Amino acid sequence: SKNLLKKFASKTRKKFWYEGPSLGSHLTPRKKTRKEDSIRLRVLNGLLYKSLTELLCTPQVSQEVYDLNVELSKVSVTSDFSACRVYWKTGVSAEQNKHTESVLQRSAAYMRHLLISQQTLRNVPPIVFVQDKRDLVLAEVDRLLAEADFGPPHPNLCGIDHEALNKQIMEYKRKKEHRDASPRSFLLGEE
Amino acid sequence: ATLNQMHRLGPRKEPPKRLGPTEGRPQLKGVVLRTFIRKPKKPNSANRKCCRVRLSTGKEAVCFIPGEGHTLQEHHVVLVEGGRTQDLPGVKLKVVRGKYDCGHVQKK
Amino acid sequence: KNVLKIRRRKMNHHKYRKLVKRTRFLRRKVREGRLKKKQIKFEKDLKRIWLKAGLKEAPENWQTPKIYLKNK
Amino acid sequence: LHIPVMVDQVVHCLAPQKGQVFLDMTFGSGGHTRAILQKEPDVMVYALDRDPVAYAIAEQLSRLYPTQIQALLGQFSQAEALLMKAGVQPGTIDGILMDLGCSSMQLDAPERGFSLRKDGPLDMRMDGDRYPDTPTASDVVNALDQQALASILRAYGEEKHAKKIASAIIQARSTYPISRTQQLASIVAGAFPPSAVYARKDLLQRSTHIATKTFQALRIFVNNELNELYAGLRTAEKFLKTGGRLVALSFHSLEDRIVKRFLLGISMTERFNLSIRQKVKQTSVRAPLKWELIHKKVLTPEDQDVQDNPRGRSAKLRAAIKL
RNA sequence: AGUAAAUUAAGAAUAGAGAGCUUAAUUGAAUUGAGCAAUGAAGUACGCACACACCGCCCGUCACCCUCCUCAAAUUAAAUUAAACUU
RNA sequence: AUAUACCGCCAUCUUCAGCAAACCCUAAAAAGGUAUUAAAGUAAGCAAAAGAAUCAAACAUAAAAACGUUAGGUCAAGGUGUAGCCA
RNA sequence: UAACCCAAACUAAUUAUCUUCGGCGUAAAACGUGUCAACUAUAAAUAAAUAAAUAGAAUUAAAAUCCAACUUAUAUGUGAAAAUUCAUUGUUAGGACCUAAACUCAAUAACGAAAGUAAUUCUAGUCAUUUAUAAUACACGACAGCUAAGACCCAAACUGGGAUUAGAUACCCCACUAUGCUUAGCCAUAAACCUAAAUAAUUAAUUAACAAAACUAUUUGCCAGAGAACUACUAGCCAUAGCUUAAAACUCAAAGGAC
Ligand SMILES: Nc1ncnc2c1ncn2[C@@H]1O[C@H](CSCC[C@H](N)C(=O)O)[C@@H](O)[C@H]1O
Ligand SMILES: [K+]
Ligand SMILES: [K+]
Ligand SMILES: [K+]
Ligand SMILES: [Mg+2]
Ligand SMILES: [Mg+2]
Ligand SMILES: [Mg+2]
Ligand SMILES: [Mg+2]
Ligand SMILES: [Mg+2]
Ligand SMILES: [Mg+2]
Ligand SMILES: [Mg+2]
Ligand SMILES: [Mg+2]
Ligand SMILES: [Mg+2]
Ligand SMILES: [Mg+2]
Ligand SMILES: [Mg+2]
Ligand SMILES: [Mg+2]
Ligand SMILES: [Mg+2]
Ligand SMILES: [Mg+2]
Ligand SMILES: [Mg+2]
């Protein structure tokens, strides 16, 4: 009789859904921007964010990776869908991050297998693990700072050039001291 | 509406035809009281010649004087007719040229 | 679907409410006097009835009720 | 007569006491200076003004207190030299009172040209015969072009209608010289229809003339009060004792901004946004504050009092201690 | 990048007249991102009461003249009635 | 006199990528017309590209750059429409 | 100047002749809700049968508040500040309170005429008129508001204080009222909007657009260019700066809906 979902069913149907049995060219393993592509890539980034967190903090990948307990900063797939860029949260310790980077990357192939096997995502492209460049720079600006040595222990204000205006005044003081488209032509015979 | 509702109400009620400046009469005779200029509402630009008159009914109205040039003055007698002046708001009467004191436009 | 027709009514009601606020005291005196005339008209209409019927005085024990005054 | 406005707030804020040296950079009529010398008869005070008439008033009033008041004549920029000629006697000044605006005597007297309501010459120059070559408002209006003249009205008078008002002055001066205060007022009031002559109601809920902004603009430009004020506050800080209390009164926003920005470490140089994407919030500073603001909180005089002195309605009292 | 910079020569037009112009040659660098917070452009999505196209459109208080209407203290003005019954 | 009647010769976005014409399609079309593992678009012109120039070769530089935008500039290069002067 | 129309007429003004089987999601138009009559239509013999209707009583988990012990020197607050505050702050498996409001469940779609209703328990309780169709009657009706007596954790018009600004009677910060709560009564208004009256059929012999596919029949209500106008006057009302009912003059040649 009264359905709360009716209010927003038609609005969310153009924002979060497209019609027709068409899959994108990118989504294949091997142009003009479309709205369906934005939907087809937004949902994958959410599924992979949900599904790639069910591997890092779960025991399937490995015992060391399970112990790593890697939370993820964000997941973002390329528009071409050639590969993925799984950003991961990066602790302050640079050395540990370097080791964690290598560990995750080695299991990238197996992690993909785990998702593809479970059937959450049928055709997942190769995965990558990247460190946020912002985080790396902030760490580097701290490393170099520690290494670094600090050594041994009026008219223009208001906006009117009062001086120039005074000269202009003193200088002045020195001087002081729809019709042709009708059928008329056709109906007369002027051809 | 249903056939029962059309029966209970019958034909549509017709608002009465309210009268205009001439009060449902072809013409009225009036005495000029003042002669002045009225400005046409934009987008038009002119100094339209009008006059106030006291009609035979006893009311006073503003009447447009057509033609290029009139000799009307106060206390003159004129025969007014209907017809609004489209640019002049409120001017719903016009003077008849060639009747009583008002005369035909002098041809150039 | 714009709200333009709602905005015209919005301004009319706003301006009308401020007009009533300015002349609130005047409106009060108009009403008290309109009710008094409303009461006199009611009494006279009741006097017309018994006088037309032929009575020279109102029915015994009858006093016209004051129905428009601040009785409630 | 004009009572010194908000003097009680200044007097309490200054707390004049024996053995303290004070300065007044705007003696003018001397009402404020006399109030400081009444609370404490043993206080030491120095006076200054740009008007030679005002300086004479101080010299005449110096008889009342032979050494407690020291009279000086000059601008804010020339104040440092005048106090330097005296020597180090001002030295660590406990308080510098920098009241702003036109003197009661200056604007009450029609001859000085400050009053548009009265008919006088268009002098509008606080400086008297001390400098006879200082251009008056008559010279400013008759010389500057629309571009220059409009900027004076827009920048110093906060004139909303700057191009129309400026053009009327340029046309009027060509027809006849603009030499009288009322002549200029009519010229400014002629750029608009007759309805706008006296229409601009103020926050006071009292109507005012349409050329009040032109007189304020010319008043500040002829006397370059704003630029000279920038140097007066800087020289007060240099001459202000550590822990000394500064007190200023700002009757319009332009002077208030310099006093408001100065006492909070902000700079008048700061560029201006113009009502598009202003970052009031972001949806820092080179150094910290250099003052202990006894009364960062500002206020105008009481509205009842304002009726008695409408000139002082917009008086904002800004008090601070040197750090 | 043989660029900038520096330093030369010639030419046009003149009787003569440039610190200007056109052209040729010589010597000969530094630097180019872990780019897009902003500015501008392009693309995609969305909004629009704009189409003179945001330097757009647009709403109220205030101000004269003119049109119509309402209320209201009182005053007066005309209007408008209907019969009751005795002998 | 009028570059707001124009030709002529140019500036500008511009070394920007579009312009115009003939067709075809739409449960009507004010317009729009793409998917390559292809779903209504197609076959030709101008520009671009190519080519030529700087006398090997490349690169580079020049030149080239449509249709429009700014009633952009020029009646004083010359010519010319309209109006005006002719002791 | 030449053409055109009418013609002993011709043109102007005034007046009259044409009059409901059309509509009601978005353009005017389904009433805030339900019940009882009389007609006009219809024709079946049921209903209800523990998910949050409603009313009463009892009850309480979390988080606050107050009190106490101990305790930092600050606490609070913003984009950044200021004011405010140290009578504060943090902890308490300490005491009191039962004020106020009911996370998850709820990705559910139930109950009720609508309004509205979801912490737990118990008591009372929804149900059969064939069906549609009702006002001048009766009973209801969010929030805000009024009246009297209480409550008071938190929130908060107004107000005061602080910022911002050309100004800032605002947006932001802090404090604190009316008020939101209970018990009696009033008030009767919502974009009371699924912007869909109810009921019974049909899905094909059917694209104005958009929304929510089209469409027939029955009954009532409602609409008739826009503004003036949720207005003036009238009548009723516990309403008194109120609600319902609801015009005309005058102005305009459009207003309005969808794309
Ligand atoms: N730049 C400047 N230098 C010095 N004095 C100035 C000045 N600008 C304004 N003044 C003067 O300062 C005074 C300000 S108004 C008068 C206030 C004074 N305290 C009194 O009691 O009268 C006037 O006398 C004015 O002429
Ligand atoms: K016209
Ligand atoms: K040309
Ligand atoms: K709704
Ligand atoms: Mg209105
Ligand atoms: Mg030469
Ligand atoms: Mg041109
Ligand atoms: Mg080419
Ligand atoms: Mg031009
Ligand atoms: Mg020529
Ligand atoms: Mg020329
Ligand atoms: Mg409607
Ligand atoms: Mg405040
Ligand atoms: Mg309270
Ligand atoms: Mg209603
Ligand atoms: Mg509701
Ligand atoms: Mg209402
Ligand atoms: Mg009403
Ligand atoms: Mg009424």
Nearest to D227 among A154, A170, A172 (CB): A154
- Which of chain A's residues 53-82 bind strand E, using a 7 Å CB cutoff? none
Subunits close to B (at least 3 CB pairs below 8 A): none
Buried b (16+ CB within 10 A) or exposed e, D162-198: beebbebbbebbeeeebbebbbbbebbbbbeeeeebe
The span from the CA of C47 to the CA of C39, in Å, is 12
The length of chain C in residues reads: 72
Tokens of D91: 């030295």
- Asked if D136 contacts D124 with a C-beta cutoff of 8 angstroms, the reply is yes
d(CA A47, CA A45): 6
Residue type, position D292, single letter: E
How far is it between the farthest Cα atoms of chain B? 69
Q: Which element (helix H / strand E) includes D108? A: helix D104-108
How far is the C-alpha of D78 from the C-alpha of A31, rounded, in Å? Answer: 72
Do residues D290 and D317 touch, judged by C-beta distance below 8 A?
no
Q: Contact partners of D by the rule of 3+ C-beta pairs under 8 A?
A: A
Q: Please identify every residue whose CB atom is under 5 Å from ligand 5, which is an ion.
A: C 12
Take residue A46 and report the two structure tokens written for it. Answer: 């959410």
Nearest CA to ligand 1 atom 12: D26
Provide CB contacts within 8 A for D98, sequence distance 6+: D25, D26, D229, D232, D233, D236, D246, D247, D248, D249, D259
Q: Is the CB of A9 under 7 A from strand E?
A: no
Helix axes D253-262, D225-239, angle to 10 degrees: 30
The 3-state secondary structure of chain A reads: CCCCCHHHHCCHHHHCCCCCCCCCCCCCCCCCCCHHHHHHHHHHHHHHHHHCHHHHCCCCCCHHHHHHCCCCCEEEECCCCCCEEEECCCCCCHHHHHHHHHHHHHCHHHHHHHHHHHCCCCCCCCCCEECCHHHHHHHHHHHHHHHCCCCCCCHHHHCCCHHHHHHHHHHHHHHHCCCCCCCHHHHHCCC
Window 33-52 of chain C: CB closer than 7 A to strand E: 33-34
Residues listed for chain B = 108
Which structure tokens are listed for D212?
């009040």
Bases along strand F below 7 A from a protein CB = 34-37, 39
D2, D234 Cβ separation under 8 angstroms: no
**Secondary element (H or E) of residue D260:** helix D253-262
Q: Are D225 and D9 in contact (CB under 8 A)?
A: no
Distances (CA, A) of D172 to A117, D160, D178, D179, D188: 90, 20, 7, 11, 9
Cis peptide bond N-terminal to B15, omega within 30: no
Nearest residue: Cα versus C1' of G252: B89
Instruction: Name the residue with tokens 């004070």.
Output: D22
The answer to whether the Cβ–Cβ distance between A154 and D142 falls below 8 Å is: no
When CB atoms are compared, the residue of D140, D142, D231 closest to A154 is D231
Are the Cβ atoms of D227 and A170 closer than 8 angstroms? Answer: no
Query: Any chain A CB within 8 A of the CB of D57?
Result: no
The torsion angles phi and psi of C8, rounded to 5 degrees, stand at -65, -45
CA angle at D318 for the pair D230 and D267, rounded to the nearest 5°: 40
Tokens of D178: 């603009």
Strand D21-24 and strand D95-99: pairing? parallel
Sheet architecture: strand order including D291-295: D69-70, D44-47, D21-24, D95-99, D245-250, D316-322, D291-295
